[PDB]
């Protein structure tokens, strides 16, 4: 089958193929090379991501998604077309049905854009599923039962908090905080506290190697950047402790969103959640200590889903199947 489900992410795009499972997982990045005043797609995916902050004059690496939704519809369509062609079975001659996730707080305008974009990229039919519903399905929560389940999907562009019951949404919210904001927080910390300018690739490395939702000093790494006062290369050693300082603001927004969700939840469902806890999915769920930070501020158990990067795609795939 060429029918597919797409986790169209701010940072990463995953495709689940009907009958096969997850068949693609690539950064949501497009490189355009400017030849003859006109722009030509140079690369898509991991190769393009490797170019960020390192492009020469006639090249640019672009992320066409922002805050969980399509920003640059022309480039996003090229991206989607590329990914779909990549996984396409050449024995199939029928345009695919496509399920695509969308942030629960996405505007009417933003939802229309995802639909139009997938159609423009070849889909014969597009169905939208709410991200936190997909995430909860993918994480294996009992969303069809008469019981309250809470999921928190921390993506690249948004954090989706939802309470699900009986195959529906009891409460949902998209918060504009996620992997990108955390990277931006790290960039800002380095500039303000260490007079050092770093690029996104370095911030990503910091986040991944020593990033944490709470102080441990802990381990340290050495990072390079531009000394802001002298304009020359400079190296600084940064600890998990310092990474926690840097991430404090976005981590706090996530924790607050969870508490706001709990407050909004009816008593019987809220009690179900108190019993089984909160489920974390998405790239952000891998942030060391985030589960414990949420646990300590809410007093509720917190679990990280199996394969948290893949939960939304698995859930979309389940609905496709």
Residue numbers in the entry: 10 to 225, 229 to 333
What does the paper say about this structure?
In non-spherical bacteria, the actin homologue MreB is essential for shape maintenance as depletion of MreB through genetic knockouts or MreB-targeted drug treatment results in misshapen cells that eventually lyse. The MreB fibres are attached to the cell membrane via a hydrophobic loop in Thermotoga maritima as well as Gram+ bacteria and via an additional N-terminal amphipathic helix in Gram− bacteria. Here, we demonstrate that MreB from Caulobacter crescentus forms pairs of antiparallel protofilaments as revealed by crystal structures, an architecture unprecedented among actin-like proteins. The crystal structure of Caulobacter MreB (ΔCcMreBdh) reveals the typical actin fold, containing two domains on either side of a nucleotide binding cleft (Kabsch and Holmes, 1995).
Deleting the N-terminal amphipathic helix and mutating the residues in the hydrophobic loop make the protein (ΔCcMreBdh) less prone to aggregation. In contrast, the crystals of Caulobacter MreB contain doublets that, remarkably, crystallised in an antiparallel arrangement. Although the resolution is low, the entire double protofilament structure of ΔCcMreBdh fits nicely into the 2D averaged EM images with a longitudinal subunit repeat of 5.1 nm and the widths of the doublet encompassing 6.5 nm. (C) Scaled double protofilament from the ΔCcMreBh crystal structure (d_e) was positioned into the EM density obtained from the 2D averaging. Once MreB is in the polymeric state, the presence or absence of nucleotide has very little effect on the overall structure, which is presumably stabilised by inter- and intra-protofilament contacts. The antiparallel arrangement of protofilaments of C. crescentus MreB as revealed by the crystal structure and by EM is unprecedented within the actin family of proteins. It ensures that the amphipathic helix of both protofilaments can bind to the membrane and that both protofilaments are able to interact with bitopic proteins, such as RodZ.
